Design a protein around this ligand. Structure first.
Ligand SMILES: Cc1ccc(NC(=O)[C@@H]2CCCO2)nc1
Ligand SMILES: [Zn+2]
Ligand SMILES: [Zn+2]
Length: 580
């Protein structure tokens, strides 16, 4: 308690000594509360006019138009301590998993140099605005790094002064850039050196790309076993237990020297003890603390979520295979049996999974997995939208399985080669491309964001009639040389010809494609079946859509007139119906 968080708490008091008060009407049950002080402040979703003017049929589809309009009673909940047998299963599995992940990787500190290059090319590091304006400016000022040094030497001393969370089924905990640096220095290696790549972790898909996920799920489907399970957890970050945080911290057992001490301090001082500021309109700032739940930077959050999910799913596989009888207590000989299972089949059982943070797909040895719920419930990883003791419903076809907000189609090219393509309901794709975040967008910057969406569509959703047409329209409407912008692998963020990029991604660099014959035109690249395209949300067959497609050059010219006298290319004749 207060010997680890007091100093952060003490320091905040003094900066608002005029305003401090232990409010007696505080809403917190599960968070420890310390005091309150005076503030007054809050960023809505803005519409991208370039994308909207070129998707007119969708202006009357509420599933699209409602996306641009507009649980903190899940953060204020508690998770019970797991049973002794569950705690033993988790410790053995976590110890074994950090060893496996460490066999071909070397933990190492990330550098000021590396951190500086990140900020100077826009990565969402979840910092706050004070002394300097932006992240770019703080990193170029030696005073900042002296603040970093003071904290850093404080962490080597096993103490913390300035690493404080700011709160804002989502919850993003911003810290000041300095605290983010110290997190990146100690634990950035997990992401920077690809610890959760599929090659290194067997279950992971870190860095794989949306064009590979479908092929990965089809490879899982080829294994002998039961149904494919894809159970979502209800509020994963809120169900991370102190026992989870202690098993995650065992990565420090693989470290040495300074790095070991710096990482032990991030885990002890910022993860296993936390200090948070929350805006309450009743507008004061509340300073609350708790030991458990996830509240790290989003990139460290991804890797540790992947780790703990891999651990949880291996234990649920052990339960279905009858490796242990009860979570109440592991006998001495069940411990040897669990250890022996991991050594003997651990790597095979990891390859039966695709895991991206809290999101998983598991093809277990058989369907006993479906009703193996005691370890999963007791670890606090309670399934969403199913009763606690009701057996999981599995998927019989890898093309029906949800993963990373998509499903995957098998699409055969006119030349017989096989594409496995990502897909989701087309209203979600068009509704997201119509939204921008943040203020002060010029018309040029808005156009370049529309171009990023259009290029992603050409690369990942070319098989959807309406998106290949809308992508061609947007690329025809935005000046040819203007560079796509945004505020896993993003191959569409380029000014290279999209047919050349398509060839590189789907043919040349695609390890599931044996014949490397380049495609010469977009007309060789297939669509879904017309009925499948409608099932997944196409407007093909509607009067509104036919008028849009027929008159698309008039829409392209409306946008060109707004942007002005610039160099444009006509990409519409890449499509058969516009090719005269
Ligand atoms: C593991 C993984 C890899 C890729 C993706 N998603 C994407 O690349 C796109 C960018 C915009 C939303 O979808 N999601 C998960
Ligand atoms: Zn600190
Ligand atoms: Zn689909």
């Amino acid at each position: 308690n207060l010997d680890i968080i007091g100093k952060r708490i003490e320091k905040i008091k003094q900066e608002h000594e005029t305003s401090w008060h232990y409010d007696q009407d505080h809403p917190y049950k599960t968070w420890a509360y310390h005091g309150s002080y005076e503030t007054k402040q809050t960023a809505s979703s803005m519409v991208n006019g370039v994308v909207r003017l070129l998707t007119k049929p969708w202006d009357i589809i509420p599933m699209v138009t409602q996306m641009a309009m507009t649980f903190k009673e899940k953060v204020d909940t508690r998770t019970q301590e797991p049973k002794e047998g569950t705690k033993k299963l988790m410790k053995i599995t976590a110890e074994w998993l950090w060893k496996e992940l460490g066999k071909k990787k070397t933990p190492r500190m990330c550098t000021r140099e590396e951190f500086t290059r990140k900020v100077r090319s826009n990565a969402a590091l979840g910092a706050i605005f004070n002394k300097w304006k932006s992240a770019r400016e703080a990193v170029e000022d030696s005073g900042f790094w002296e603040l970093v040094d003071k904290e850093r030497n404080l962490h080597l001393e096993g103490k913390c002064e300035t690493c404080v969370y700011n709160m804002m089924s989502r919850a993003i905990w911003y810290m000041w850039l300095g605290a983010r640096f110290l997190e990146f220095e100690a634990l950035g290696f997990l992401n920077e050196d690809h610890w959760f790549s599929r090659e290194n972790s067997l279950s992971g898909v870190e860095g794989e790309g949306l064009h590979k996920l479908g092929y990965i799920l089809r490879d899982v489907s080829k294994k002998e076993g039961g149904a494919m399970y894809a159970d979502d957890t209800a509020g994963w970050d809120t169900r991370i237990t102190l026992e989870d945080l202690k098993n995650e911290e065992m990565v420090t057992n693989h470290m040495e020297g300074e790095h070991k001490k710096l990482a032990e301090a991030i885990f002890k001082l910022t993860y296993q003890n936390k200090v948070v500021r929350v805006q309450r309109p009743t507008t004061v700032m509340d300073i609350i603390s708790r030991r458990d739940q996830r509240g790290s930077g989003q990139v460290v959050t991804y890797g540790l979520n992947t780790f703990t999910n891999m651990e949880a799913q291996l234990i649920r596989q052990m339960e279905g295979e009858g490796v242990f009888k009860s979570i109440q207590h592991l006998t001495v000989t069940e411990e040897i049996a669990v250890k022996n299972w991991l050594v003997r089949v651990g790597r095979e059982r990891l390859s039966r999974m695709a895991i991206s943070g809290d999101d998983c797909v598991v093809k277990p040895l058989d369907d006993r997995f479906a009703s193996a719920l005691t370890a999963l419930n007791d670890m606090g990883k309670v399934r969403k939208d199913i009763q606690q003791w009701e057996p999981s419903r599995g998927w019989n076809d890898w093309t029906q399985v949800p993963f990373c907000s998509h499903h995957f189609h098998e699409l055969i090219m006119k030349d017989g080669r096989v594409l496995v393509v990502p897909c989701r309901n087309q209203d979600e794709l068009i509704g997201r491309a119509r939204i921008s975040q943040g203020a002060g967008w010029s018309l040029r910057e808005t156009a370049c964001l529309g171009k990023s969406y259009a290029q992603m569509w050409s690369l990942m959703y070319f098989h959807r009639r309406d998106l290949r047409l809308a992508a061609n329209a947007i690329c025809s409407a935005v000046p040819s040389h203007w560079v796509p912008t945004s505020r896993a692998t993003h191959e569409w963020m380029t000014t290279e010809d999209m047919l050349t990029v398509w060839n590189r991604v789907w043919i040349q660099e695609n390890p599931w494609m044996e014949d490397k014959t380049p495609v010469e035109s977009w007309e060789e690249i297939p669509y879904l079946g017309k009925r499948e395209d409608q099932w997944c949300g196409s407007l093909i067959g509607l009067t509104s859509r036919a008028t849009w497609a027929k008159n698309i050059q008039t829409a392209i010219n409306q946008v060109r007139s707004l942007i002005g006298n610039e160099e444009y290319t006509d990409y519409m004749p890449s499509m058969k119906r516009f090719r005269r």
